[PDB]
Amino acid sequence: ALFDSLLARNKKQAEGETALGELPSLQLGLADLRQRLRKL
Amino acid sequence: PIPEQIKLIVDKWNPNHPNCAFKTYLYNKVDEHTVPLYGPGPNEDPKEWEEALQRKPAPNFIPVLCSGFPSIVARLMLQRRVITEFNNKLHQINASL
Amino acid sequence: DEDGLISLIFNKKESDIRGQQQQLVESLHKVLGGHQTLTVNVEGVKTKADNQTEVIIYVVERSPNGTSRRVGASALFSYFEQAHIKANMQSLGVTGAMAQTELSPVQIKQLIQNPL
Amino acid sequence: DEDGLISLIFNKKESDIRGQQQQLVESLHKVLGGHQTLTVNVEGVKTKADNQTEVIIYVVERSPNGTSRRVGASALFSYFEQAHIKANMQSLGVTGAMAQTELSPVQIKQLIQNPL
Amino acid sequence: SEALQQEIAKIDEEIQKCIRDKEAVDAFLPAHGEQLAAIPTDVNFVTRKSEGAHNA
Amino acid sequence: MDEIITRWATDLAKYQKEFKEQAAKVMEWDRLLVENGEKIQKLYTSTYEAERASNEIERQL
């Protein structure tokens, strides 16, 4: 249930809300993400 | 030399321990300070006992005399009896989680 | 352990168990020696398969001072697993038994060191 | 409990108790109903204060078959604590009583659940 | 030949009676074996769900 | 009559060699049992900790 909680947390993460700053972040993945990782 | 082999075979298949030929020792865990107890009984050779204690896997273990089949059956009996306890406790953990 | 519950599997249909519950309970009382200081109670009856029924029991024991308490589950299981008692139980249709108490590691170690 | 000993405190001087022991013992016999199947025995007499004396007794009961035994301490105490009997005892100078039997937890629980 | 032929019978019977116990062991193994093998898979599973709760 | 002693001794050695194996297997199983048991206890601890912590968070909210 660990990975499940990781999903769940990363799911609730990118979904609002009214927290005065933390807006949901768009997910990338795979192609764009590798380059986004390399650009670190 | 015929009535010797026969008697020796009758001796082999027996719980009296005249060279039982089904001599294996199993280590039962026992926390301190109960190590000083046990303490074999009727037909235990200190040789076998000490030799068992010699190649000890870990401390707080005491050897146990398994002569023949009813003993290994009994060991199994215990193993199941603990199997169920294990599963139960594990399910408790599961439930609380 | 103090709740004293022992689950028994019977090779009998549930309707048969319930239909003769008085008799079943008294036979269990007889297996225990039949004294008036022991009383068998049925905690539950549940079908498990066409011809399999689980019956959960406990036993109340009374002291000479009139006090009552349940026989501990481990103690009751220990009695029922004795070879003579197990055989009598099998004659009533019992094909298995279980206690709910989760034994400690030291208890388990003791049972393995002395399986009889 | 089988020794049947009941300790009684009297609001009387020891010399007075001993001086009239025959009479005291018979009065206790009367409180018990006075039948010839009961016999009050004095186990001991001890001064506790100027005008306080402890008298330890037991009662032997005889059966129809000639057998004798002591009345159990709990049974005898139960009789003496009954309100009517206690009042009669107080008229003899008894101001307290005690049995030596240490009751079991179940006995104690029963007494608390049914104090009367 | 009576005492001998009887003695061999009793002996061989006893041995055979012991081998019955040996067989009795052999019979009660695989089930218990599965039961045993089941354990580490569950504790290795429940330990995971705990990690999930802790991370939660 | 030797043909009987041969059978006896062969059976003996044959079933000895097997009894040894059974016993060994049982031993290994015991090792497995305690080896897991330790982990079960660890789970008990970890769980109790989690429980207490959750209770604390409950108190906080």
Tokens in use for C24?
Answer: 């079943």
Cis peptide before E52 (omega within 30 of 0): no
Residues of F with CB under 8 A from a CB of E: 4, 8, 11, 15, 18-19, 22, 25, 29, 32-33, 36, 39-40, 42-43, 46-47, 50
Three-state DSSP at F43 gives helix
The secondary element (H helix, E strand) that includes residue C55 is strand C52-62
Compute the distance between CA of residue C88 and CA of residue D37 in angstroms, rounded to an integer: 49
**Is B90 in contact with E43 (Cβ distance < 8 A)?**
yes
Tokens in use for D64?
Answer: 């129809």
C46 to chain D, minimum CA–CA distance in Å? 34
Cis peptide before B91 (omega within 30 of 0): no
Three-state DSSP at D53 gives strand
CA distances from D109 to C66, D2, D6, D101, D105 (A): 9, 22, 22, 15, 6
* Number of neighbours of residue C16 by Cβ within 10 angstroms: 14
* Number of neighbours of residue E37 by Cβ within 10 angstroms: 11
* Closest-approach residue (CA) in chain E for F34: E40
* Number of neighbours of residue E13 by Cβ within 10 angstroms: 10
Scanning D47-106 for CB atoms below 8 A from C yields 103-106
Contacting residues for E2 by C-beta, under 8 A, at least 6 apart? none
**Is F16 in contact with B21 (Cβ distance < 8 A)?**
yes
DSSP state of A25: P
Is D109 in CB contact (< 8 Å) with chain C? yes
Closest of C109, E54, F13 to residue B13, by C-alpha: F13
Least CB-CB distance to F27: which of B13, B26, B93?
Answer: B26
**Is E28 in contact with B83 (Cβ distance < 8 A)?**
no
Contacting residues for B77 by C-beta, under 8 A, at least 6 apart? C111, C115
Compute the distance between CA of residue D36 and CA of residue D34 in angstroms, rounded to an integer: 7
| Gap between the terminal Cα atoms of chain C | 21
AA identity, residue B18? P
Structure-solving method: cryo-EM
Across-strand partners of D58? Answer: D41
